[PDB]
Design a protein around this ligand. Structure first.
Ligand SMILES: O=c1[nH]c(=O)n([C@@H]2CO[C@H](CO)[C@@H](O)C2)cc1I
Ligand SMILES: O=c1[nH]c(=O)n([C@@H]2CO[C@H](CO)[C@@H](O)C2)cc1I
Lengths: 300, 304
């Protein structure tokens, strides 16, 4: 059957990601803004940033924050999750392509990166983070993930110029999310170089050091037993983390250039990306409508 | 290679489910229990208590539906966590459909936390139908050999027994008993509907044994005004969530166990049903031992 190329442009918010994808037999699955502001719940982006503000202000407790942040992250990841579930059966083994699917973010942004960042923010429990991790859908073949690079001071500049409605400029949240995605990129390399977190776990007390991968975040006292040992349930959540990330193809896009440049840069990276066959000839058209319908309904 | 038999004993609470499985294992069979220690300690503090108090508060009007929902949605994540990792860690060892060299008796299936309780809580006014669908979209792929046993018990018998099966922190909420009973009845119907070639998209306009009316399956719950577009049609996102619902439930093997008997009887009844259950091969003959430790470690750490 025809081949399909899927590209998930992910990374921290405030880099120009949505723009450069606009700038690119190619369909675009944008940011689920209408689902975040209306369909799933009322103004979720606003709810998220206010809560952190309240928490930071001490007007609420960490536990209230957590209960709100955990509930909000469910809403934020819903469109990403169904799309993947409805898409999964059409994806065949790894294989110009007959269809290029450009996505605005992968499911891991809602199910992993933002939760870890919010945990780093004091607004989410590490146990919840692992619950979302356990819920990460099996990584299909041809999962090419593009993460962005941008010097911090420059990022503060782009971050400022484009806050979604309800957003607040939280530089603390900018540092946590940037940290989380940096670790995510390291975790993939670590894993692909044969890294075994169980073996390198003690080091927390070619290939990155386990202390430079996401695994270092789960060395939290809530997840450890009176003797330091990670509880098995959590250890298993890490086995899933390892599993999900290892088959992902990560590509780095430098956002410290102009929109036409980022667009150009994104097109070059496209060559080393993994393609796949679809499961039926009629998967291409179906995938198309899916994307085109997702956009029409949830795009804003 | 060796074969494996998986049996998930599910259904409403207060029926004696956990008991009969203990009894069954007391008879190459490992038991994966309700993860109470994870609910009361490891994942969070006294989650069962949190759940029932919230409903109480809500019912009392001491809090709003929106607060309730934020708490129920968060609590249900904690409740389903052990179920979810267990399935993800188990999934690669499961081979195609095939005396089992190992029988894995589970205490509920991931759908109890990811589907049934949420729908029930939605029915209770403590959860949004949008949240319910988010959990439904997170339901892990249904492995081959997923035999689910659901229980039957007349309402009055259940009512009295419920009162006799209060978990620490639970309250006798008969409204929640009716909602959950309703949700699981629908679940059983949905599976038959699906196996009889039912298409919710076709029967949408309408909202063993023959096929049920879509109005008697879970699909009827999602005919909620929150999920309805200006034109009266379901939003696509939610329609897709129902495609996943249909997909996940259609490959499940549902068996009904009558709990209106004695514990030794339920145990005996459970053993007969075991014959028509689907077995599967493991992916590595050494999957058998691994699965064993998994279950034996899950129990030792989360059982309580
Ligand atoms: O799970 C998520 N959680 C969030 O808080 N966001 C944020 C939503 O608002 C903006 C969308 O980029 C960013 O500020 C990220 C995104 C996701 I995807
Ligand atoms: O998702 C769930 N949510 C729940 O509220 N429960 C309830 C928890 O308390 C008892 C044991 O699980 C029953 O009252 C069910 C179980 C599950 I599994």
């Amino acid at each position: 059957m025809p081949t399909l190329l899927r590209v998930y442009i992910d990374g921290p918010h405030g880099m120009g990601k949505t723009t450069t994808t606009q700038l690119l037999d190619i369909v675009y699955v944008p940011e689920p803004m209408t689902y975040w502001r209306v369909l799933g719940a009322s103004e979720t982006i606003a709810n998220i940033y206010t809560t952190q503000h309240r928490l930071d202000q001490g007007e609420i407790s960490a536990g209230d924050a957590a209960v709100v942040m955990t509930s909000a992250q469910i809403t934020m990841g819903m469109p990403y999750a169904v799309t993947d579930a409805v898409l999964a059966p059409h994806i065949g083994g790894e294989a110009p392509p007959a269809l290029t699917l450009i996505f605005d973010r992968h499911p891991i942004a809602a199910l992993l990166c933002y939760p870890a960042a919010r945990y780093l923010m004091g607004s989410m429990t590490p146990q919840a983070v692992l619950a979302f991790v356990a819920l990460i859908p099996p990584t299909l073949p041809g999962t090419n993930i593009v993460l962005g690079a941008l010097p911090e001071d420059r990022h503060i500049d782009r971050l400022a110029k484009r806050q979604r409605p309800g957003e607040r400029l939280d530089l603390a949240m900018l540092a946590a999310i940037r940290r989380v995605y940096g670790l995510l990129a390291n975790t993939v390399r670590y894993l692909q170089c044969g890294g075994s977190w169980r073996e390198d776990w003690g080091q927390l007390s070619a290939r990155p050091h386990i202390g430079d991968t996401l695994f270092t975040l789960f060395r939290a006292p809530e997840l450890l037993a009176p003797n330091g040992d990670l509880y098995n349930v959590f250890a298993w959540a890490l086995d899933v983390l390892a599993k999900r990330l290892r088959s992902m193809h990560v590509f780095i896009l430098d956002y410290d250039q102009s929109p036409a440049g980022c667009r150009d840069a994104l097109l070059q990276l496209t060559s080393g990306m993994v393609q796949t066959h679809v499961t039926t000839p009629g998967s291409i058209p179906t995938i198309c409508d899916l994307a085109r319908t997702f956009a029409r309904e949830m795009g804003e």
